[PDB]
C-alpha cells in the first residue's frame, strides 16, 4: 500500500520536496532540539499531540538505523564495502528522517497552520529562477 | 533520550518481553493483515486513532528498510559482505518492527485493553512449567 | 507461634498444598513479572493494598537470601560444603517464597476471589485419575 | 528493583541506620514481645493493621532462617565451615530482622507518629559527638 | 562582595562559630539525613522554602567537590601531591559546607527560631568553664529524653 | 539524591547545555555584573527572590573554589600539579558556575520566562543552517 507520512497532517511528499537538501539541520541537531524542548512530553505515557506520536516513532526509527551502522562497522570483513553502507544510512536514509524530524518539531514549535503556510511560500520562492526572486529565503521564526 | 514506543499506549518493552521473540508473525504476514483490514484508514487524509499514526510510521520504517536492502543488492560487489547486510535487515532489524506491527494491528482489531490483558495472559502461560501448561496457547481471537 | 502467611488473605497452607511443588514458576520468572507489572506501586511511598505490603517483604526476603548466597560464594573455602549451602537457598529455601511470590502477584493481577477459586479448581484437576482428567490444566488467565 | 521496607510507613533505611547495633533486643526477645502482646491479632484472618501484615512476614522470614541454621548444623561434613554460616544467620542476617521486628512492634505499641518522631531525635543525638551531647540516650516509653 | 550564607536566615558566621569545629557530623551523615526526610522536597519541581533552595546548592557544591576529588585520583600521577589535595577537599573544604548542611537541615526539622535559640544556649554552655558546666549539653530534640 | 539546580526555576542542565559551551561570559565578568547590579540586595538580611538565594550560594561556591586554587598555587611542590589542578578548577568547574551565574543574573535582569524563551530561541537559532535564519544572533536587552 502507498502511505505518505504527512497526509494526516495536511501536507504531502510533494509539498516538502521543494525544500533543498541543505535546509534541514543535521540529525544530531534535530535530536538535540527535541530532547531540549519536548522531553517531558515525549517521555510521557500521554498522547499529548498527534505530532508527538509521530515524533516518538521517528526518533526510534533513527535509533535502530544508528544501531545498524554500529553493526556494519563492527563485523564486516573488508573496510571497502562497509564505507558505502554507513555513508548510505547517514546521508541517503538520514535525509528522509531529517524532514520527518523537522516537520514535527516545527509543527509543535510554530504551529501546524504556520508550517503549512510557510511550505507554500517556500515553494513559490524556490520554483522561481534566481534572477526573479528576492535573494534571501523566507524564514519561520514568528516566535 | 531513552524513549519507549509502547509507554504511550499503556504498555512497556518489558511487558512486550513476556511474548517470546519467535512469536510474532512475519512482516509479509503482518503487512497483508494491515492491507486487507485497514487500507482506507491508513491511506486516509486524517488520523483516526493514535494507533493509526504509529502504524503509518511503522510501515514507512520498513519501506525505508526495503529500499536499503534493494540498495545493498544493487551495490556492494563483494558478495560475502552483501549477504551479511541484507540478512541483518530481514532478521535482526525486522524484529523490532515486527513487535511494533503486531502491537498496533492487534490493538486496532481487538482493542487496547484486550491486547494488554493478552500480554499478561501469555505471560502466565509461558511462565508455567511444561508439566502443567496446556497444549494450547492463548490467541487474541476475542471475536467469534 | 504457629503463624500462617495466607490466613490473612482467606487461604491456608493446606489450600496452597493443592498445587504441587513443581508448579510455581522460578523466582527469576516471578520477579520479572513483578518488575514489569508492579514497579511504580512496590516502590510507591504508600501501601496500596495488603498484597503489596506482603509482596515488598517477600522480595526483600529473597534479597536477604541472595546476599547470603553471595557471601557463601565469597567465603567457605572448603568447596564441597559451599555448594551444599548455596543450592539449599536456591532450591529448598527458594520454594517457600516461590509460593509466596506466586500467590501475591496473581492476587494483584486477577484478584483474591479468582485465585482462591483457582486453588480449588486446580485441586479438582490434580485429584482426578489420569484416565479421566483433561490434557490441559487450568490457567489463571481470566483476562482475555 | 529497589524497595526499602519502611517507605510505606514513612521511614527509610537512612532513618533507621543511625540506631546502633546494640539498640535492638535479641531476636528471641523481639519474638517474645510479639507473641505476648499481639498474638490474637497476628494469628488472625483479619488485616488489623499494615504493621500487622509486615510483622507476620518478618516472623516467618526468621522461621525459615532458623530452619536454615538447623539444616547447616545437621548435614555439613566439616565443623569448620558450618560455624561461619550459623554465625552469619544469627548476627549478620539477624540484625536486619531485629530492626524490622523492632520497628513494627514499636509502631503498634507507641504509635507510628511517635516512632518516626523518636527516630529523628535519636538521629540528632547519635550524630552529635560524645563531648557535646547529654550522656543518656532518649527513650521511647511514653506509655 | 562580602557576602554571608547565613545572614539571610537570621544568623551570621560568628553566630555559627559558637559551635566548635569538631561539633558538626560528617558530610555522609548529613547527606543521609537530608535524603531521609527531604527527598521528595529537595527534588521537587518547585521551591518550597529558602532552606530548600539553599540546601539544593549545598549538596550540589559537595557533588562538584567530589567529582573533583575523583578526577584528582584518576589523574595526577605524582603520589606525594595527589593525596594532600584529596585531603584538602575532604576535611578543609567539607567543613564549610558541614555548617551549611547542619544549619539548613535543622531549620527544616525543628524551625528557624528553635535553631537560633539553640545557638545562643549552646553558646552559654560552651563558654562556661568546665568546673561550673552542667554535664548535659543543650540539644535540639523535639522529644524529651524521657519522652 | 539527584538534584537538578535549575529544576525549581523551570529549566534543566539539558536546556542550559543546549547553548554552546563558549557562549557564557567569563566568571570575572559575571561576578562584575553581579557586584554592579545586585550588591545591596545580595548583601541583605532578606531573601527577596529564589534567584538571590541561589546566586549567593553560587558566589560562595566560587569563592571556596578560588580559595582552593590559591591553596594549590601556594603549597604543592610538583609544578605539573599546579598546571593540572588549578586549570581543572577553572576550565571545568568554572563552566558550570558560568552557566549558573549567567542564568541567575539574567533571570534577575530580564525575567525568568524571557531567559527560558531566549534559551530555546538561541538553541534553535544555532542549530539552524545559516542561510535560513535571521543573520544576527539574539540578545536579551532592556533598552527599547
Residue numbers in the entry:
A (entry chain B), D (entry chain B): 1 to 143
B (entry chain A), C (entry chain A), F (entry chain C): 1 to 144
E (entry chain D): 1 to 147
Quote the study that presented this structure, word for word.
After data collection, 127,410 T = 4 (84%) and 23,257 T = 3 (16%) particles were chosen for further analysis. A homogenous dataset of the remaining T = 4 particles was subjected to icosahedrally-averaged refinement yielding a ~3.2 Å resolution map. This reconstruction reveals a Cp layer similar to those seen in previous EM and crystal structures. Density for Cp chains is complete up to the start of the ARD. At this resolution, the four distinct Cp monomers of the quasi-equivalent capsomer, chains A-D, can be built using polypeptide chains 144, 143, 144 and 147 residues long, respectively. The icosahedrally-ordered Cp surface lattice surrounds a second, less-ordered internal layer of density, which may well include density for the encapsidated gRNA transcript and the Cp ARD domains. Reconstruction of the same dataset without the imposition of symmetry fails to reveal any further molecular detail at 4.2 Å resolution, the internal density appearing as a mostly continuous layer underneath the Cp shell. Cryo-EM reconstruction of the JQ707375.1 RNA transcript assembled NCP, reveals extensive density below the globular folds of the Cp shell. Symmetry expansion suggests that there are multiple contacts between this internal density and the outer shell at particle symmetry axes. It is not possible at the resolutions obtained to assign this internal density to either the C-terminal Cp ARD domains, the gRNA transcript or a complex of both.
The roles of RNA sequence/structure motifs, Packaging Signals (PSs), for regulating assembly of an HBV genome transcript have been investigated in an efficient in vitro assay containing only core protein (Cp) and RNA. The 3200 bp long genome encodes four overlapping reading frames for polymerase (Pol); surface proteins (HBsAg); the cell regulatory factor protein X; and the core and pre-core proteins (HBcAg and HBeAg, respectively). Pol and Cp proteins are translated from the pgRNA, which also serves as the template for reverse transcription within the NC shell. We propose that they act as Packaging Signals (PSs) helping to ensure faithful encapsidation of the pgRNA, by analogy with the mechanism regulating assembly of many bona fide ssRNA viruses.
